[PDB]
Each structure stands twice: as C-alpha cells, then as structure tokens.
C-alpha atoms as a PDB file:
ATOM      1  CA  UNK A   1      17.561  -7.158 -15.588  1.00  0.00           C
ATOM      2  CA  UNK A   2      14.559  -7.468 -17.904  1.00  0.00           C
ATOM      3  CA  UNK A   3      11.094  -6.024 -17.283  1.00  0.00           C
ATOM      4  CA  UNK A   4       8.967  -8.116 -14.942  1.00  0.00           C
ATOM      5  CA  UNK A   5       5.268  -8.993 -14.844  1.00  0.00           C
ATOM      6  CA  UNK A   6       2.443  -7.263 -12.905  1.00  0.00           C
ATOM      7  CA  UNK A   7       4.291  -8.409  -9.749  1.00  0.00           C
ATOM      8  CA  UNK A   8       6.293  -5.207 -10.330  1.00  0.00           C
ATOM      9  CA  UNK A   9       3.410  -3.417  -8.567  1.00  0.00           C
ATOM     10  CA  UNK A  10       3.827  -5.592  -5.478  1.00  0.00           C
ATOM     11  CA  UNK A  11       7.594  -5.109  -5.399  1.00  0.00           C
ATOM     12  CA  UNK A  12       6.903  -1.452  -4.558  1.00  0.00           C
ATOM     13  CA  UNK A  13       5.843  -2.646  -1.104  1.00  0.00           C
ATOM     14  CA  UNK A  14       9.245  -4.250  -0.528  1.00  0.00           C
ATOM     15  CA  UNK A  15      10.792  -0.813  -0.034  1.00  0.00           C
ATOM     16  CA  UNK A  16      11.166  -0.110   3.679  1.00  0.00           C
ATOM     17  CA  UNK A  17      12.313   2.838   5.746  1.00  0.00           C
ATOM     18  CA  UNK A  18      11.229   6.258   6.950  1.00  0.00           C
ATOM     19  CA  UNK A  19      12.637   9.185   5.016  1.00  0.00           C
ATOM     20  CA  UNK A  20      12.896  12.593   6.664  1.00  0.00           C
ATOM     21  CA  UNK A  21      14.562  15.939   6.029  1.00  0.00           C
ATOM     22  CA  UNK A  22      17.269  16.643   8.591  1.00  0.00           C
ATOM     23  CA  UNK A  23      18.273  20.264   9.196  1.00  0.00           C
ATOM     24  CA  UNK A  24      21.719  19.170  10.365  1.00  0.00           C
ATOM     25  CA  UNK A  25      23.019  18.269   6.911  1.00  0.00           C
ATOM     26  CA  UNK A  26      20.096  19.803   5.060  1.00  0.00           C
ATOM     27  CA  UNK A  27      19.082  16.736   3.075  1.00  0.00           C
ATOM     28  CA  UNK A  28      16.348  14.128   2.790  1.00  0.00           C
ATOM     29  CA  UNK A  29      17.674  11.053   4.596  1.00  0.00           C
ATOM     30  CA  UNK A  30      16.227   7.643   5.435  1.00  0.00           C
ATOM     31  CA  UNK A  31      16.091   6.266   8.969  1.00  0.00           C
ATOM     32  CA  UNK A  32      14.385   3.279  10.588  1.00  0.00           C
ATOM     33  CA  UNK A  33      13.588   5.025  13.849  1.00  0.00           C
ATOM     34  CA  UNK A  34      10.842   7.660  13.822  1.00  0.00           C
ATOM     35  CA  UNK A  35      11.793   8.477  17.410  1.00  0.00           C
ATOM     36  CA  UNK A  36      15.243   9.658  16.337  1.00  0.00           C
ATOM     37  CA  UNK A  37      14.069  13.133  15.349  1.00  0.00           C
ATOM     38  CA  UNK A  38      12.802  15.719  17.797  1.00  0.00           C
ATOM     39  CA  UNK A  39      12.112  19.343  16.922  1.00  0.00           C
ATOM     40  CA  UNK A  40      14.854  19.481  14.289  1.00  0.00           C
ATOM     41  CA  UNK A  41      12.656  17.665  11.781  1.00  0.00           C
ATOM     42  CA  UNK A  42       9.024  18.241  10.849  1.00  0.00           C
ATOM     43  CA  UNK A  43       7.131  15.000  11.459  1.00  0.00           C
ATOM     44  CA  UNK A  44       5.044  15.727   8.359  1.00  0.00           C
ATOM     45  CA  UNK A  45       8.240  15.404   6.329  1.00  0.00           C
ATOM     46  CA  UNK A  46       8.854  11.920   7.719  1.00  0.00           C
ATOM     47  CA  UNK A  47       7.246   9.349   5.451  1.00  0.00           C
ATOM     48  CA  UNK A  48       7.687   5.593   4.869  1.00  0.00           C
ATOM     49  CA  UNK A  49       9.306   5.181   1.446  1.00  0.00           C
ATOM     50  CA  UNK A  50       6.867   2.295   0.932  1.00  0.00           C
ATOM     51  CA  UNK A  51       4.023   4.760   0.383  1.00  0.00           C
ATOM     52  CA  UNK A  52       6.229   7.716  -0.554  1.00  0.00           C
ATOM     53  CA  UNK A  53       6.422   6.473  -4.142  1.00  0.00           C
ATOM     54  CA  UNK A  54       2.631   6.565  -4.401  1.00  0.00           C
ATOM     55  CA  UNK A  55       1.077   9.856  -5.443  1.00  0.00           C
ATOM     56  CA  UNK A  56      -2.669  10.002  -4.848  1.00  0.00           C
ATOM     57  CA  UNK A  57      -4.341  11.977  -7.624  1.00  0.00           C
ATOM     58  CA  UNK A  58      -7.810  10.988  -6.457  1.00  0.00           C
ATOM     59  CA  UNK A  59      -9.056   9.716  -3.092  1.00  0.00           C
ATOM     60  CA  UNK A  60      -8.265   6.024  -3.511  1.00  0.00           C
ATOM     61  CA  UNK A  61      -6.440   6.321  -6.834  1.00  0.00           C
ATOM     62  CA  UNK A  62      -2.663   6.490  -6.484  1.00  0.00           C
ATOM     63  CA  UNK A  63      -0.113   6.789  -9.284  1.00  0.00           C
ATOM     64  CA  UNK A  64       3.414   5.433  -8.943  1.00  0.00           C
ATOM     65  CA  UNK A  65       5.861   8.275  -9.376  1.00  0.00           C
ATOM     66  CA  UNK A  66       9.094   6.575 -10.358  1.00  0.00           C
ATOM     67  CA  UNK A  67      10.880   9.930 -10.036  1.00  0.00           C
ATOM     68  CA  UNK A  68      10.606   9.323  -6.277  1.00  0.00           C
ATOM     69  CA  UNK A  69      13.233   6.616  -6.767  1.00  0.00           C
ATOM     70  CA  UNK A  70      15.722   9.351  -7.672  1.00  0.00           C
ATOM     71  CA  UNK A  71      15.351  10.642  -4.118  1.00  0.00           C
ATOM     72  CA  UNK A  72      16.319   7.156  -2.973  1.00  0.00           C
ATOM     73  CA  UNK A  73      19.126   7.295  -5.531  1.00  0.00           C
ATOM     74  CA  UNK A  74      20.441  10.226  -3.491  1.00  0.00           C
ATOM     75  CA  UNK A  75      20.795   7.788  -0.590  1.00  0.00           C
ATOM     76  CA  UNK A  76      22.426   5.220  -2.910  1.00  0.00           C
ATOM     77  CA  UNK A  77      21.511   2.401  -0.519  1.00  0.00           C
ATOM     78  CA  UNK A  78      19.543  -0.109  -2.590  1.00  0.00           C
ATOM     79  CA  UNK A  79      19.782  -3.034  -0.177  1.00  0.00           C
ATOM     80  CA  UNK A  80      19.105  -0.875   2.869  1.00  0.00           C
ATOM     81  CA  UNK A  81      15.805   0.388   1.471  1.00  0.00           C
ATOM     82  CA  UNK A  82      15.279  -2.989  -0.209  1.00  0.00           C
ATOM     83  CA  UNK A  83      14.502  -1.756  -3.715  1.00  0.00           C
ATOM     84  CA  UNK A  84      13.044  -4.634  -5.685  1.00  0.00           C
ATOM     85  CA  UNK A  85      14.536  -5.695  -9.002  1.00  0.00           C
ATOM     86  CA  UNK A  86      11.210  -4.886 -10.801  1.00  0.00           C
ATOM     87  CA  UNK A  87      11.762  -1.429  -9.310  1.00  0.00           C
ATOM     88  CA  UNK A  88      15.300  -1.223 -10.689  1.00  0.00           C
ATOM     89  CA  UNK A  89      14.033  -1.975 -14.186  1.00  0.00           C
ATOM     90  CA  UNK A  90      11.011   0.318 -13.699  1.00  0.00           C
ATOM     91  CA  UNK A  91      13.483   3.184 -13.372  1.00  0.00           C
ATOM     92  CA  UNK A  92      14.300   2.504 -17.025  1.00  0.00           C
ATOM     93  CA  UNK A  93      11.277   0.933 -18.738  1.00  0.00           C
ATOM     94  CA  UNK A  94       7.964  -0.560 -17.657  1.00  0.00           C
ATOM     95  CA  UNK A  95       5.254  -3.141 -18.266  1.00  0.00           C
ATOM     96  CA  UNK A  96       2.582  -0.924 -16.784  1.00  0.00           C
ATOM     97  CA  UNK A  97       3.379   2.655 -17.966  1.00  0.00           C
ATOM     98  CA  UNK A  98       2.392   4.060 -14.610  1.00  0.00           C
ATOM     99  CA  UNK A  99       1.636   1.698 -11.764  1.00  0.00           C
ATOM    100  CA  UNK A 100      -1.843   2.697 -10.694  1.00  0.00           C
ATOM    101  CA  UNK A 101      -3.560   1.454  -7.564  1.00  0.00           C
ATOM    102  CA  UNK A 102      -7.179   2.223  -6.786  1.00  0.00           C
ATOM    103  CA  UNK A 103      -9.741   0.522  -4.583  1.00  0.00           C
ATOM    104  CA  UNK A 104     -13.483   1.089  -4.624  1.00  0.00           C
ATOM    105  CA  UNK A 105     -16.367  -0.358  -2.630  1.00  0.00           C
ATOM    106  CA  UNK A 106     -19.250   0.913  -4.725  1.00  0.00           C
END
C-alpha cells in the first residue's frame, strides 16, 4: 500500500471498461458492451475508462486527472474495472505529482 515507481503511469492502462451515462437510472455506469446502448445514451458520453483518466491539455500532452477515479469510486467495483494498486495509492499520494504523457516527433 506504499507509493510505487514510474510503473504507476503504466498501471493506468490496466483499467478496462466503457463508461456511459444511462438515462434509465440517471448515472454514469460502466459496461463492457458498447452495443448495449441505443438511443437512450449519447455515444459521445461512452468512453473507455482507460483513456477517460487522461485529460489532454495540449494536442499530445495529457495530464492524469486522479479525480476521475472518484467517478469509478461511484461504481465501487475495483476488480471489475481492474484498478491497479499504484492507482489505489495515487488516489492518496504520488511519486509523479501529475502523471503526464506526451509524445512528439519533431
């Protein structure tokens, strides 16, 4: 339960599932079938939680918003989404203050 190494950044990829806002219960829920929702859910609101935690502030520069994890906390299913242990600790403290990912080809 201690803070991990840079691998913490990679553990953010371990999270799996497609989260979407259902108008039936009126909440943001996670499913594994994108085909499950018809016209009751906006497809733009359906996003893989893997990339949902990444907030692009530039083109190729994304910042990890750990507050996104609180939305997963609403679901309360840690094993279902597969939240890494580095992610569990990241909710509290961090090695990298904000996990930043950027790729350039210049």
